[PDB]
Short mmCIF file of N, CA, C and O in Angstrom, two decimals:
data_model
loop_
_atom_site.label_atom_id
_atom_site.label_comp_id
_atom_site.label_asym_id
_atom_site.label_seq_id
_atom_site.Cartn_x
_atom_site.Cartn_y
_atom_site.Cartn_z
N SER A 1 121.95 74.27 96.36
CA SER A 1 122.88 74.94 97.17
C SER A 1 123.51 76.16 96.70
O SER A 1 124.96 75.96 96.60
N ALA A 2 123.13 76.89 96.92
CA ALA A 2 123.45 78.47 96.09
C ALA A 2 123.61 79.41 97.87
O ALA A 2 123.55 79.64 98.97
N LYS A 3 124.56 80.13 97.33
CA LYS A 3 125.14 80.53 98.06
C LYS A 3 123.77 81.23 99.03
O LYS A 3 122.51 81.81 98.55
N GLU A 4 123.67 81.85 100.68
CA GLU A 4 122.31 82.10 101.14
C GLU A 4 122.00 83.65 100.21
O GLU A 4 122.19 83.99 100.13
N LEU A 5 120.46 83.13 100.06
CA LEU A 5 119.76 84.10 99.38
C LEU A 5 120.20 85.82 99.76
O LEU A 5 120.54 85.66 100.82
N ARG A 6 120.30 86.75 99.49
CA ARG A 6 120.45 87.95 99.68
C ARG A 6 118.90 88.50 100.40
O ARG A 6 118.46 87.97 100.73
N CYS A 7 119.34 89.56 100.77
CA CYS A 7 118.11 90.74 101.86
C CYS A 7 117.06 90.13 101.30
O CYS A 7 116.11 89.28 101.31
N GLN A 8 116.51 90.76 100.01
CA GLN A 8 115.05 91.14 99.24
C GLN A 8 115.11 90.49 97.70
O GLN A 8 115.15 89.05 97.60
N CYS A 9 115.73 90.77 97.04
CA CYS A 9 116.29 90.60 95.88
C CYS A 9 117.00 91.51 94.69
O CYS A 9 117.39 92.82 95.83
N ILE A 10 117.67 90.73 94.00
CA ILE A 10 119.01 91.68 93.07
C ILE A 10 118.60 91.64 91.82
O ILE A 10 118.78 92.96 90.98
N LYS A 11 117.16 91.57 91.23
CA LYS A 11 117.17 91.65 89.31
C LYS A 11 115.52 92.40 90.16
O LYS A 11 115.35 92.66 91.07
N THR A 12 114.51 91.98 89.04
CA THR A 12 113.25 92.76 88.93
C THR A 12 111.95 92.66 89.45
O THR A 12 112.91 91.58 90.52
N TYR A 13 111.34 92.78 89.20
CA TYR A 13 110.16 92.35 90.53
C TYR A 13 110.71 90.81 90.85
O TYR A 13 110.26 89.92 91.88
N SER A 14 111.39 89.87 89.93
CA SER A 14 110.37 88.26 89.76
C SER A 14 111.63 88.29 88.28
O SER A 14 112.33 87.78 87.47
N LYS A 15 111.34 89.33 87.19
CA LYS A 15 111.12 89.19 85.53
C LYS A 15 110.94 90.41 84.89
O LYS A 15 110.76 91.10 85.77
N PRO A 16 111.93 90.40 83.62
CA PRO A 16 112.26 91.72 83.09
C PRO A 16 110.82 92.07 81.60
O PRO A 16 110.20 91.23 82.27
N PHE A 17 110.97 93.28 82.12
CA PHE A 17 109.69 93.99 80.61
C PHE A 17 109.53 94.91 81.14
O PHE A 17 110.40 95.82 81.42
N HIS A 18 108.94 95.73 80.04
CA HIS A 18 108.64 96.34 80.22
C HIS A 18 107.84 97.28 81.70
O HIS A 18 107.01 97.05 81.20
N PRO A 19 108.87 98.06 81.97
CA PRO A 19 108.41 98.79 83.10
C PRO A 19 107.43 100.05 83.08
O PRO A 19 107.00 100.24 83.81
N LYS A 20 107.29 100.41 81.78
CA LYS A 20 106.57 101.45 81.14
C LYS A 20 104.92 101.11 81.84
O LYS A 20 103.73 101.95 82.36
N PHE A 21 104.27 99.90 81.65
CA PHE A 21 103.01 99.23 81.88
C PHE A 21 102.74 99.06 83.63
O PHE A 21 102.11 98.21 83.82
N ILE A 22 104.01 99.48 83.93
CA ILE A 22 103.77 99.56 86.21
C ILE A 22 102.76 100.36 86.02
O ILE A 22 102.90 101.03 86.21
N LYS A 23 101.72 99.48 86.96
CA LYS A 23 100.72 99.82 87.41
C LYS A 23 101.31 100.69 88.67
O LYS A 23 100.88 102.43 89.24
N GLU A 24 102.27 100.31 89.62
CA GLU A 24 102.76 100.57 91.02
C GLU A 24 104.53 100.49 91.25
O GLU A 24 105.22 99.66 91.03
N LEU A 25 104.92 101.84 90.98
CA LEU A 25 105.92 101.48 90.32
C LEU A 25 107.11 102.20 91.85
O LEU A 25 107.15 102.94 92.35
N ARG A 26 107.19 101.00 93.14
CA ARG A 26 107.32 101.04 93.79
C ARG A 26 109.57 100.79 93.95
O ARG A 26 109.63 100.47 93.97
N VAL A 27 109.18 101.71 94.93
CA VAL A 27 111.13 101.47 95.01
C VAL A 27 111.53 101.61 97.29
O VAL A 27 111.32 102.56 97.78
N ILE A 28 112.64 100.11 97.27
CA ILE A 28 112.95 100.42 98.49
C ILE A 28 114.42 101.09 98.53
O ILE A 28 115.29 100.55 98.62
N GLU A 29 113.49 102.90 98.96
CA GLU A 29 114.77 103.43 99.09
C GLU A 29 114.76 104.13 100.00
O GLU A 29 114.85 105.35 100.65
N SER A 30 115.03 102.87 101.43
CA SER A 30 115.77 103.77 103.19
C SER A 30 117.41 103.52 103.22
O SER A 30 118.06 103.92 101.23
N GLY A 31 117.28 104.14 104.39
CA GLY A 31 118.89 104.60 104.24
C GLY A 31 119.53 103.10 104.27
O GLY A 31 119.36 102.38 102.94
N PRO A 32 120.48 103.11 104.76
CA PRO A 32 122.29 102.04 104.30
C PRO A 32 122.06 100.60 104.70
O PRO A 32 122.28 101.23 105.75
N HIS A 33 121.65 99.92 104.48
CA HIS A 33 121.72 98.30 105.74
C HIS A 33 121.74 97.59 104.57
O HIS A 33 123.07 97.16 104.11
N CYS A 34 120.28 97.59 104.16
CA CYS A 34 120.51 95.78 103.24
C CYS A 34 118.39 95.72 102.97
O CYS A 34 118.35 94.58 101.79
N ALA A 35 118.09 95.55 103.89
CA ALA A 35 116.57 95.90 103.65
C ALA A 35 116.36 96.46 102.47
O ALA A 35 116.06 96.11 101.44
N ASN A 36 115.40 97.55 102.62
CA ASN A 36 115.17 98.51 101.60
C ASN A 36 115.75 99.27 100.70
O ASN A 36 116.72 100.28 101.67
N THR A 37 116.33 99.87 99.60
CA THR A 37 117.41 100.25 99.32
C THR A 37 117.72 100.05 98.02
O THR A 37 118.26 100.77 97.27
N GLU A 38 116.69 99.30 96.69
CA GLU A 38 116.82 99.29 95.39
C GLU A 38 115.58 99.62 95.19
O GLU A 38 115.17 100.82 95.49
N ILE A 39 115.12 99.50 93.97
CA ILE A 39 114.28 100.07 93.34
C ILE A 39 112.83 98.55 93.09
O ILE A 39 112.85 97.73 93.76
N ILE A 40 111.64 98.94 93.22
CA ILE A 40 110.54 97.73 93.29
C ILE A 40 109.25 98.64 92.32
O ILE A 40 109.51 99.57 91.47
N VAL A 41 108.56 97.84 91.22
CA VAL A 41 107.38 97.87 90.63
C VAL A 41 105.84 97.18 90.91
O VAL A 41 105.96 96.09 92.19
N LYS A 42 105.26 97.60 90.73
CA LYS A 42 103.77 96.23 90.79
C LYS A 42 103.21 95.99 89.28
O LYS A 42 102.40 96.65 88.89
N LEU A 43 104.11 96.06 88.23
CA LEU A 43 103.85 95.51 86.63
C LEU A 43 102.51 95.74 86.12
O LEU A 43 101.92 94.33 87.39
N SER A 44 101.82 95.90 86.05
CA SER A 44 100.74 96.60 85.30
C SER A 44 99.54 95.42 86.52
O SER A 44 99.89 95.05 87.46
N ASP A 45 98.41 94.83 85.83
CA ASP A 45 97.30 93.78 86.16
C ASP A 45 98.43 92.13 86.12
O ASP A 45 97.45 91.15 85.51
N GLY A 46 99.96 91.84 86.01
CA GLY A 46 100.75 90.94 85.54
C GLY A 46 101.67 90.52 86.73
O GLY A 46 101.60 89.71 87.06
N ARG A 47 102.58 91.22 86.79
CA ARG A 47 103.95 90.87 87.54
C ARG A 47 104.18 92.16 88.92
O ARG A 47 103.74 93.38 88.89
N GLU A 48 103.97 92.06 90.24
CA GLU A 48 104.34 92.83 91.40
C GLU A 48 105.69 92.12 91.84
O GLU A 48 104.96 91.58 92.91
N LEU A 49 106.61 92.87 92.16
CA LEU A 49 107.66 92.58 92.81
C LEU A 49 108.64 93.44 93.42
O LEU A 49 108.15 95.34 93.26
N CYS A 50 108.93 93.42 93.81
CA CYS A 50 110.85 94.16 93.82
C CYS A 50 111.30 94.77 92.29
O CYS A 50 110.52 94.22 91.44
N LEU A 51 112.36 95.36 91.95
CA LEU A 51 112.70 95.78 90.93
C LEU A 51 114.50 96.10 91.12
O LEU A 51 114.10 97.48 91.82
N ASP A 52 115.37 95.60 90.47
CA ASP A 52 116.68 96.00 90.20
C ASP A 52 117.27 95.24 89.42
O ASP A 52 118.71 94.39 89.07
N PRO A 53 116.71 96.06 88.22
CA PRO A 53 117.99 95.40 86.60
C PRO A 53 119.06 96.10 86.39
O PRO A 53 118.48 96.76 85.42
N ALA A 54 120.32 95.37 86.75
CA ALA A 54 120.66 95.79 86.30
C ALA A 54 120.74 97.45 86.63
O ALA A 54 121.68 98.58 85.61
N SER A 55 119.74 98.24 87.90
CA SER A 55 120.45 100.11 87.35
C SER A 55 120.15 100.18 88.33
O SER A 55 119.55 100.18 89.43
N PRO A 56 121.11 100.73 88.42
CA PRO A 56 122.71 101.44 89.67
C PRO A 56 122.15 102.55 90.51
O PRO A 56 122.57 103.28 90.87
N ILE A 57 120.97 103.59 89.02
CA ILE A 57 119.83 104.64 89.46
C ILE A 57 120.06 104.76 90.98
O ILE A 57 120.18 105.49 91.20
N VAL A 58 118.88 103.53 91.24
CA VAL A 58 118.65 103.77 92.47
C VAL A 58 119.09 103.69 93.66
O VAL A 58 119.63 104.27 94.33
N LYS A 59 120.48 103.15 93.50
CA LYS A 59 121.34 102.99 93.93
C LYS A 59 122.77 104.31 94.20
O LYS A 59 123.06 104.48 95.47
N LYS A 60 122.31 104.67 93.18
CA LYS A 60 122.97 106.48 92.92
C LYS A 60 122.51 107.27 94.09
O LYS A 60 122.58 108.25 94.73
N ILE A 61 120.86 107.30 93.91
CA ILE A 61 120.05 107.76 95.55
C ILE A 61 120.01 107.82 96.94
O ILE A 61 119.42 108.31 97.40
N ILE A 62 120.37 106.43 97.18
CA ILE A 62 120.89 105.59 98.38
C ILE A 62 122.73 106.43 98.15
O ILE A 62 122.83 106.61 99.62
N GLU A 63 123.06 106.21 97.75
CA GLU A 63 124.37 106.28 97.09
C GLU A 63 124.72 108.20 97.88
O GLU A 63 125.81 108.46 98.54
N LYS A 64 123.46 108.96 97.57
CA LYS A 64 123.69 110.28 97.50
C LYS A 64 124.16 110.62 99.13
O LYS A 64 124.35 111.57 99.37
N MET A 65 123.29 110.14 99.82
CA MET A 65 123.62 110.52 101.48
C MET A 65 124.84 110.51 101.77
O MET A 65 125.89 110.69 102.42
N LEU A 66 125.59 109.03 101.83
CA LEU A 66 126.98 109.01 102.09
C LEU A 66 127.50 110.20 101.48
O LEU A 66 128.08 110.88 101.89
N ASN A 67 128.10 110.46 99.96
CA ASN A 67 128.28 111.89 98.73
C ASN A 67 127.66 112.78 99.82
O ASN A 67 128.60 113.51 99.92
N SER A 68 126.34 112.56 100.76
CA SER A 68 125.95 113.72 100.77
C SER A 68 127.21 114.74 102.38
O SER A 68 127.36 115.53 102.83
N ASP A 69 127.61 113.46 102.77
CA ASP A 69 128.32 113.54 104.38
C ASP A 69 129.58 114.06 103.96
O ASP A 69 130.24 113.73 105.02
N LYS A 70 129.98 113.50 102.52
CA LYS A 70 131.32 113.57 102.38
C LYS A 70 131.76 115.21 102.00
O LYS A 70 131.90 115.39 101.23
N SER A 71 131.11 116.14 102.83
CA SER A 71 131.30 117.08 102.13
C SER A 71 132.42 118.39 103.07
O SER A 71 132.96 119.36 103.08
N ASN A 72 132.65 117.67 104.32
CA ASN A 72 134.31 117.69 105.06
C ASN A 72 135.62 117.22 104.79
O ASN A 72 135.13 116.09 103.78
N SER E 1 82.41 122.05 101.74
CA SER E 1 80.80 121.69 100.55
C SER E 1 81.68 122.08 99.29
O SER E 1 81.46 123.24 98.69
N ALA E 2 82.87 121.45 99.26
CA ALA E 2 83.75 121.32 97.56
C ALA E 2 83.66 120.75 96.30
O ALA E 2 82.88 119.43 96.96
N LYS E 3 84.21 121.20 95.57
CA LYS E 3 83.95 119.85 94.13
C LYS E 3 84.35 118.34 94.67
O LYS E 3 85.00 117.98 95.78
N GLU E 4 83.59 117.84 94.16
CA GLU E 4 83.28 116.37 94.86
C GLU E 4 84.89 115.69 94.86
O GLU E 4 85.88 115.72 93.95
N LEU E 5 85.53 114.83 95.43
CA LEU E 5 86.78 115.41 95.34
C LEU E 5 87.03 114.38 94.54
O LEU E 5 86.57 113.53 93.61
N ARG E 6 88.46 114.25 94.34
CA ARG E 6 89.52 113.57 92.14
C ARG E 6 89.22 112.04 93.21
O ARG E 6 88.68 111.65 93.94
N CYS E 7 89.81 111.19 91.82
CA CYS E 7 89.70 110.23 91.42
C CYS E 7 90.88 109.41 92.97
O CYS E 7 90.11 109.27 94.62
N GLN E 8 92.13 109.71 93.28
CA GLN E 8 92.96 109.83 94.54
C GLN E 8 93.08 110.58 94.87
O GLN E 8 92.90 111.01 96.23
N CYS E 9 94.00 111.14 94.20
CA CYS E 9 95.20 112.59 95.00
C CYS E 9 95.66 113.51 93.82
O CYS E 9 95.89 112.87 93.10
N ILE E 10 95.59 114.98 94.37
CA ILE E 10 95.67 115.97 93.69
C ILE E 10 97.78 115.95 94.16
O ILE E 10 98.82 116.42 93.28
N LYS E 11 98.03 115.86 95.37
CA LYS E 11 99.39 116.49 96.24
C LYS E 11 100.23 115.32 96.49
O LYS E 11 100.14 114.17 96.78
N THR E 12 100.55 115.29 97.43
CA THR E 12 101.60 114.16 98.31
C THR E 12 101.33 113.22 98.61
O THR E 12 100.10 112.99 98.28
N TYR E 13 101.63 112.38 99.67
CA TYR E 13 101.24 111.40 100.30
C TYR E 13 100.18 111.73 100.72
O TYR E 13 98.44 111.22 100.84
N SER E 14 100.57 113.28 101.04
CA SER E 14 99.58 113.66 102.26
C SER E 14 99.75 115.23 102.71
O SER E 14 99.33 116.46 102.33
N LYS E 15 101.19 115.39 102.85
CA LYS E 15 102.32 116.83 103.29
C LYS E 15 103.37 116.35 102.17
O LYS E 15 103.64 115.02 101.77
N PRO E 16 103.88 117.02 101.85
CA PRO E 16 104.92 117.59 101.29
C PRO E 16 106.07 117.22 102.61
O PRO E 16 105.72 117.62 103.34
N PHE E 17 107.21 117.05 102.23
CA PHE E 17 108.66 116.58 102.77
C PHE E 17 109.49 115.98 101.85
O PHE E 17 109.36 116.49 100.74
N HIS E 18 110.79 116.51 102.37
CA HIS E 18 111.51 115.44 101.55
C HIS E 18 111.53 114.11 101.10
O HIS E 18 111.94 113.25 102.21
N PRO E 19 111.55 114.00 100.15
CA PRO E 19 111.55 112.48 99.29
C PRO E 19 112.01 111.70 99.06
O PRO E 19 112.25 110.68 99.01
N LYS E 20 113.49 111.80 99.90
CA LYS E 20 114.37 111.10 99.33
C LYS E 20 114.73 110.01 100.42
O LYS E 20 115.14 109.29 100.57
N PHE E 21 114.06 110.25 102.52
CA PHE E 21 113.92 110.22 102.96
C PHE E 21 112.74 108.84 102.87
O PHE E 21 112.34 108.20 103.94
N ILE E 22 112.05 108.73 101.72
CA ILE E 22 111.12 108.12 101.63
C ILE E 22 111.82 106.29 101.60
O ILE E 22 112.72 105.84 101.05
N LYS E 23 110.56 105.39 102.13
CA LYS E 23 111.19 104.28 102.00
C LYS E 23 110.47 103.50 101.16
O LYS E 23 111.52 102.58 100.47
N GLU E 24 109.20 103.83 101.15
CA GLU E 24 108.48 103.35 99.70
C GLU E 24 108.39 103.90 98.37
O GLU E 24 107.62 104.76 98.88
N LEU E 25 109.43 104.08 97.72
CA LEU E 25 108.25 105.23 96.65
C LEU E 25 107.67 104.90 95.13
O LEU E 25 107.80 103.96 94.82
N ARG E 26 106.40 104.57 95.24
CA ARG E 26 105.18 103.87 95.04
C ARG E 26 104.48 104.74 93.98
O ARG E 26 104.71 106.23 93.71
N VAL E 27 104.54 103.99 92.71
CA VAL E 27 103.74 105.33 91.50
C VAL E 27 103.04 104.59 91.03
O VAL E 27 102.80 103.44 90.60
N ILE E 28 101.54 105.68 90.67
CA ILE E 28 100.53 104.78 89.99
C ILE E 28 100.17 104.87 89.01
O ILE E 28 100.18 105.99 88.50
N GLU E 29 101.03 104.26 88.05
CA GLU E 29 101.79 104.58 86.00
C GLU E 29 101.07 104.09 85.77
O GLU E 29 101.04 103.04 85.26
N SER E 30 99.36 103.84 86.28
CA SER E 30 98.67 102.90 85.31
C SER E 30 97.95 103.18 84.07
O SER E 30 99.18 104.43 83.31
N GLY E 31 97.20 102.96 83.52
CA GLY E 31 97.23 103.58 81.48
C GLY E 31 96.30 104.99 81.35
O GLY E 31 96.71 105.47 83.05
N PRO E 32 95.93 104.79 80.74
CA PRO E 32 95.12 106.13 80.68
C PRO E 32 93.76 106.29 81.18
O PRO E 32 93.03 106.00 80.45
N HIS E 33 93.19 106.23 82.45
CA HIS E 33 91.98 107.13 82.97
C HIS E 33 91.80 108.36 83.41
O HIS E 33 91.32 109.19 83.87
N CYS E 34 91.81 107.12 85.61
CA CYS E 34 92.12 108.13 86.28
C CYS E 34 92.43 107.39 88.09
O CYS E 34 92.71 108.16 88.62
N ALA E 35 92.39 106.05 88.24
CA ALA E 35 92.77 105.61 88.32
C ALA E 35 94.35 106.02 89.28
O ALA E 35 94.60 107.00 90.45
N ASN E 36 95.35 104.97 88.88
CA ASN E 36 96.42 105.26 88.93
C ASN E 36 97.44 105.66 87.98
O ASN E 36 96.32 105.06 86.30
N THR E 37 97.58 106.75 87.94
CA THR E 37 98.76 107.79 87.12
C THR E 37 99.56 109.08 86.93
O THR E 37 100.26 109.74 87.22
N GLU E 38 99.60 108.76 88.42
CA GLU E 38 100.51 109.33 89.37
C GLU E 38 102.23 109.45 90.09
O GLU E 38 102.28 107.92 89.60
N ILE E 39 102.26 110.16 90.80
CA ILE E 39 103.15 109.70 91.74
C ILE E 39 102.76 108.80 93.11
O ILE E 39 101.95 109.26 93.16
N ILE E 40 104.01 108.23 93.82
CA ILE E 40 103.34 107.94 94.41
C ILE E 40 104.24 107.71 96.01
O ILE E 40 105.63 107.62 95.70
N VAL E 41 104.48 106.85 97.49
CA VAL E 41 105.54 107.40 97.96
C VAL E 41 105.30 106.64 99.46
O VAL E 41 104.42 106.20 99.57
N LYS E 42 106.11 105.98 100.21
CA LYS E 42 106.46 105.28 100.80
C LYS E 42 106.80 105.99 102.73
O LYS E 42 107.90 105.33 102.99
N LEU E 43 106.57 107.45 103.01
CA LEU E 43 108.08 108.22 103.75
C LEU E 43 108.58 107.75 104.61
O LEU E 43 107.34 106.50 105.62
N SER E 44 109.84 107.39 104.93
CA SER E 44 110.72 106.11 105.75
C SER E 44 109.47 105.95 106.78
O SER E 44 108.35 105.13 106.31
N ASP E 45 109.66 106.33 107.69
CA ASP E 45 108.67 105.36 109.25
C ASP E 45 107.87 106.43 109.29
O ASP E 45 107.47 106.80 110.59
N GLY E 46 106.93 107.44 108.47
CA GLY E 46 106.60 108.88 109.09
C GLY E 46 104.95 109.09 108.38
O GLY E 46 104.64 108.73 108.88
N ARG E 47 105.43 108.88 106.80
CA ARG E 47 103.95 109.68 105.96
C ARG E 47 104.45 108.21 105.17
O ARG E 47 105.35 107.91 104.29
N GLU E 48 103.13 107.77 104.71
CA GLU E 48 103.10 106.68 103.52
C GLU E 48 101.74 107.18 102.95
O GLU E 48 100.21 106.30 102.68
N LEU E 49 101.99 107.56 101.44
CA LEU E 49 100.22 107.86 100.22
C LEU E 49 100.94 108.27 99.39
O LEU E 49 101.32 107.21 98.88
N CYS E 50 99.74 108.39 98.67
CA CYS E 50 100.33 108.89 97.15
C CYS E 50 101.24 109.84 96.44
O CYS E 50 101.81 110.19 97.34
N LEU E 51 101.20 110.32 95.40
CA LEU E 51 102.29 111.56 95.34
C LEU E 51 102.18 112.37 94.21
O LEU E 51 102.60 111.47 93.04
N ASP E 52 102.00 114.08 94.40
CA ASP E 52 102.06 114.23 93.12
C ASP E 52 101.99 115.81 93.39
O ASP E 52 101.00 117.03 93.17
N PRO E 53 103.36 116.39 93.83
CA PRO E 53 103.94 117.39 93.97
C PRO E 53 103.76 118.03 93.09
O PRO E 53 104.92 118.38 92.57
N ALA E 54 102.50 118.88 92.67
CA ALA E 54 103.07 119.75 90.90
C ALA E 54 104.39 119.29 90.00
O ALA E 54 104.86 119.89 89.56
N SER E 55 105.13 117.71 90.65
CA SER E 55 104.96 116.79 89.69
C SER E 55 104.56 116.31 88.26
O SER E 55 104.06 115.71 88.48
N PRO E 56 104.62 117.02 87.39
CA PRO E 56 104.23 116.60 86.03
C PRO E 56 104.88 115.53 84.70
O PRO E 56 104.65 114.49 84.44
N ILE E 57 106.29 115.39 85.77
CA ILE E 57 106.98 113.41 85.25
C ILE E 57 106.47 112.99 85.36
O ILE E 57 106.64 112.06 84.13
N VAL E 58 105.75 112.57 86.48
CA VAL E 58 105.10 110.89 85.83
C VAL E 58 104.10 111.58 84.59
O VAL E 58 103.34 110.16 84.02
N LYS E 59 103.85 112.46 85.14
CA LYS E 59 102.53 113.00 83.37
C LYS E 59 102.86 112.44 82.51
O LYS E 59 102.70 112.36 81.56
N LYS E 60 104.24 112.68 82.23
CA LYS E 60 105.13 113.04 80.71
C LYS E 60 105.38 111.11 80.31
O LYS E 60 105.28 110.60 79.90
N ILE E 61 105.34 110.79 81.72
CA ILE E 61 105.21 108.88 81.78
C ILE E 61 104.08 108.47 81.24
O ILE E 61 104.09 107.47 80.53
N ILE E 62 103.13 108.96 81.18
CA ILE E 62 101.58 108.61 80.26
C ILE E 62 101.35 109.12 79.79
O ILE E 62 100.80 108.39 78.97
N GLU E 63 102.03 110.38 79.27
CA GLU E 63 101.30 110.69 78.53
C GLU E 63 102.27 110.23 77.25
O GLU E 63 102.14 110.41 75.94
N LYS E 64 103.80 109.63 77.32
CA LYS E 64 104.58 109.31 76.23
C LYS E 64 103.36 108.36 75.81
O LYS E 64 104.38 107.67 74.34
N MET E 65 102.70 107.30 76.21
CA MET E 65 101.67 106.89 75.88
C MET E 65 101.30 106.95 74.33
O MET E 65 101.45 106.45 73.72
N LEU E 66 100.24 108.08 74.68
CA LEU E 66 99.50 108.71 73.77
C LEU E 66 100.15 109.35 72.80
O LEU E 66 100.41 109.20 71.55
N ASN E 67 101.71 110.28 73.43
CA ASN E 67 102.59 110.42 72.48
C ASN E 67 103.42 109.05 71.02
O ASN E 67 103.63 109.28 69.98
N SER E 68 103.07 108.18 71.90
CA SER E 68 103.47 107.12 71.25
C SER E 68 102.86 106.60 69.99
O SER E 68 103.05 106.45 68.81
N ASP E 69 101.88 107.03 70.11
CA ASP E 69 100.78 106.36 69.17
C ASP E 69 100.59 107.17 68.21
O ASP E 69 100.35 107.11 66.75
N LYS E 70 100.54 108.76 68.41
CA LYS E 70 101.18 110.23 67.85
C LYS E 70 102.45 109.75 66.87
O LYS E 70 103.14 110.98 66.69
N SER E 71 102.26 108.71 66.18
CA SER E 71 103.48 108.44 65.08
C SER E 71 103.19 108.28 63.26
O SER E 71 103.59 108.04 63.02
N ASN E 72 101.94 108.66 64.08
CA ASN E 72 101.55 108.82 62.89
C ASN E 72 99.97 110.11 61.78
O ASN E 72 101.09 110.42 62.74
#
């Protein structure tokens, strides 16, 4: 009975780990909405899902869109 | 009749473009071999393939493995 799940996820693929051994680093960097807009990965041959470990980086890449429009 | 194609690719997904509008940024960052070890992406709703636009960055992420072992 917790708040309705969010769009995709807010944490790592599912678990934290060394993202260095990631075979596929996927990043949901779509426009501004809710579907894709965070980080993602494919942990070597063990874990593979989205990615959002308290890393606002990717939020800054999506954030630059708005900020780009904030030139007037 | 050109040199046998390489492993996956050496350039972008297929074409260059603003990687900013990429919906999925995938990165083949596997160990050291030849399969996956470069950058990759999913250009918004238009282009989606690997990624290696003269960007050695990703090569530096894979390179840190060796260099990590070069501590002795």
